[PDB]
């Protein structure tokens, strides 16, 4: 286990045996792909192979090393104000959680229909000094599950978190990080959906009807400062203890908007990665 | 234990067995609620149920995960002065401890008549720079049990804490946190009370007559600085190792003042969460 796990030799690939010639009836190279199945032909079948003892692991080819990597999914921003502190809808951010506000990562999942996992969120606040001294800028990142008082503005009553989660980070002390259980009323997170809100010819249809997980509200606790700032707290996300069901063809058209498939670009012709050839005859 | 505790499957709910029809005498659906008791009827009784093996824990529905969550209960503030340092009643705060200076959390308890628990207090000081440089602003949070010299002003003799508790936090070093034993002369903390100070038709009556636990005095040790500041040291509180006796109906009227029940708003009609319907016939 160790060795196999430390040496990373858990999932090893078979070796290529030796072959000889075949002047025989059954032709393995011939199958009818219309059966929708996949051929099973190998080196050893087609050629006169040798003998190679392999040693490549398919460890890094696991839904956990494919998925289990932190990725920017949101960049909370706060261009502070000292003029009007508080006021409605200010100096405090509110974001509705989702993995598709950022291509990159959105891409990656979408490779599967259904997914499930415990998520680890890492917060990277970066304090840009627009003043001659930033002081001590404390911070509060509160997680607001669906149906909850979302701060109208900066000091509501909701920042008491008498029963909510608020992580606090003060300049110097390291990056805040915290794990979260799989949050879904469903056995898995719906990476896609072919459902609607209802029969209302004005109902919603997508990966939204289904996943409404709440929001994350940022505040900069410290009160009024003298010299201004702008805070940019980056939100990275990692999938630990993941499972995936029914793979899908990757995406080749740059999306737009989330919780939707829509590609149809603003005017520009729909562009894809495929390149053009002069002729099939020469590559 | 582990698994059950790590998997959080300690308090599990029964499953819904299978039923068949009943053309029989005893009618479980009929009971007389006037007995003040509660009915005992179930799915299986009323319908022709199936068979569902459950898997929901009532772990998070425990007075400890209901109560055991940190909540703002006080926001100590100090608008420093350099003009007059010391002086009487300045640059040092004094707060008399209580869980009801902040709705949110006050709310939550009040759900029960009596309560008991060890409390963990977390201090979140936030230093707002009103100057061009905040220096090194050290801090002293002293706990003054009842009947003790409460600092008249900033440097008394009481800040020696020869036999008192004073926690010190210096800009950079993390949030101060400390636990405290259940402090009451009584077997439990009186969430409510129907007693008075005495027969004096001018005596006190409430949750105050009873709980007078002392005070917490804040000081900013550092001496005189050049560039001003304002400190806001937030006081969060968590209930660990809690017990509760005799539940009560929640609160629906926004209170005012603490250690009292009084709702009667200043002029405004008493408002509650209930919404109005046009008709009972359609919901």
């Amino acid at each position: 286990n160790y060795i196999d796990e430390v040496l990373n030799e858990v999932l090893v690939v078979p070796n290529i045996k030796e072959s000889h010639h075949t002047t025989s009836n059954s032709a393995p190279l011939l199958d009818a792909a219309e059966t929708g199945h996949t051929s099973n032909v190998q080196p050893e079948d087609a050629i006169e192979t040798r003998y190679v003892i392999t040693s490549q692991t398919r460890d890094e080819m696991s839904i956990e090393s494919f998925l289990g990597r932190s990725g920017c999914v949101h960049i909370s921003r706060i261009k502070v104000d000292y003029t009007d502190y508080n006021g409605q809808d200010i100096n405090f951010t509110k974001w509705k959680i989702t993995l598709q506000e950022m291509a990159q990562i959105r891409r990656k999942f979408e490779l599967f229909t259904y997914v499930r996992f415990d998520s680890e969120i890492t917060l990277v606040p970066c304090i840009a000094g627009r003043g001659d001294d930033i002081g001590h800028i404390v911070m509060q990142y509160m997680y607001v599950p669906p149906g909850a008082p979302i701060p109208s503005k900066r000091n509501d009553f909701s920042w008491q978190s008498g029963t909510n989660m608020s992580i606090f980070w003060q300049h110097g002390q390291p990056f805040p990080r915290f794990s979260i259980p799989f949050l879904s009323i469903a056995s898995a997170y719906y990476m896609f959906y072919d459902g609607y809100d209802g029969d209302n010819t004005s109902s919603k249809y997508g990966s939204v009807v289904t996943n409404d997980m709440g929001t994350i509200c940022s505040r900069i606790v410290t009160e009024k400062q003298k010299l201004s700032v702008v805070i940019t707290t980056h939100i990275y996300h990692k999938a630990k203890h993941t499972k995936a069901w029914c793979p899908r063809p990757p995406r080749a058209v740059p999306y737009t908007h989330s919780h939707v498939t829509n590609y149809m670009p603003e005017t520009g012709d729909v562009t894809t990665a495929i390149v053009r050839r002069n002729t099939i005859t020469t590559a | 234990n582990y698994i059950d505790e790590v998997l959080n499957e300690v308090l599990v709910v029964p499953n819904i067995k299978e039923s068949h029809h009943t053309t029989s005498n005893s009618a479980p659906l009929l009971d007389a609620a006037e007995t003040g008791h509660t009915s005992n009827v179930q799915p299986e009784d009323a319908i022709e149920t199936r068979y569902v093996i459950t898997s929901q824990t009532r772990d998070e529905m425990s007075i400890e995960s209901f109560l055991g969550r940190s909540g703002c209960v006080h926001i100590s503030r100090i608008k420093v002065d350099y003009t007059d340092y010391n002086g009487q009643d300045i640059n040092f705060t004094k707060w008399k401890i209580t869980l009801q200076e902040m709705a949110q959390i006050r709310r939550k308890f009040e759900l029960f008549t009596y309560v008991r628990f060890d409390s963990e207090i977390t201090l979140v000081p936030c230093i707002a720079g009103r100057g061009d440089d905040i220096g090194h602003i050290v801090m002293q949070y002293m706990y003054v049990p009842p009947g003790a010299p409460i600092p008249s002003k900033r440097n008394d003799f009481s800040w020696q804490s020869g036999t008192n508790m004073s926690i010190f936090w210096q800009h950079g070093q993390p949030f101060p946190r400390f636990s405290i034993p259940f402090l009451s002369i009584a077997s439990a903390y009186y969430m409510f009370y129907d007693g008075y100070d005495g027969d004096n038709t001018s005596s006190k009556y409430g949750s105050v007559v009873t709980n007078d636990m002392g005070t917490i005095c804040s000081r900013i040790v550092t001496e005189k600085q050049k560039l001003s500041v304002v400190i806001t040291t937030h006081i969060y509180h968590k209930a660990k190792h809690t017990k509760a006796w005799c539940p009560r109906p929640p609160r629906a009227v926004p209170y005012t003042h603490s250690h009292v029940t009084n709702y009667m708003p200043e002029t405004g009609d008493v408002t509650t969460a209930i919404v109005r319907r046009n008709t009972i016939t359609t919901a």
Binding site: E5, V10, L11, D59, S62, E64, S65, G68, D118, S179, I180, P181, F182, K240, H241, T242 | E5, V6, L7, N8
Partner: peptide, 19 residues
């Protein structure tokens, strides 16, 4: 060094294993 789930909950733990 391992299997020391310093934290209670399971959701908090390292990247799972392989089998």
């Amino acid at each position: 060094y391992f299997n020391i789930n310093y934290f209670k909950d399971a959701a908090s733990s390292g990247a799972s294993r392989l089998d």
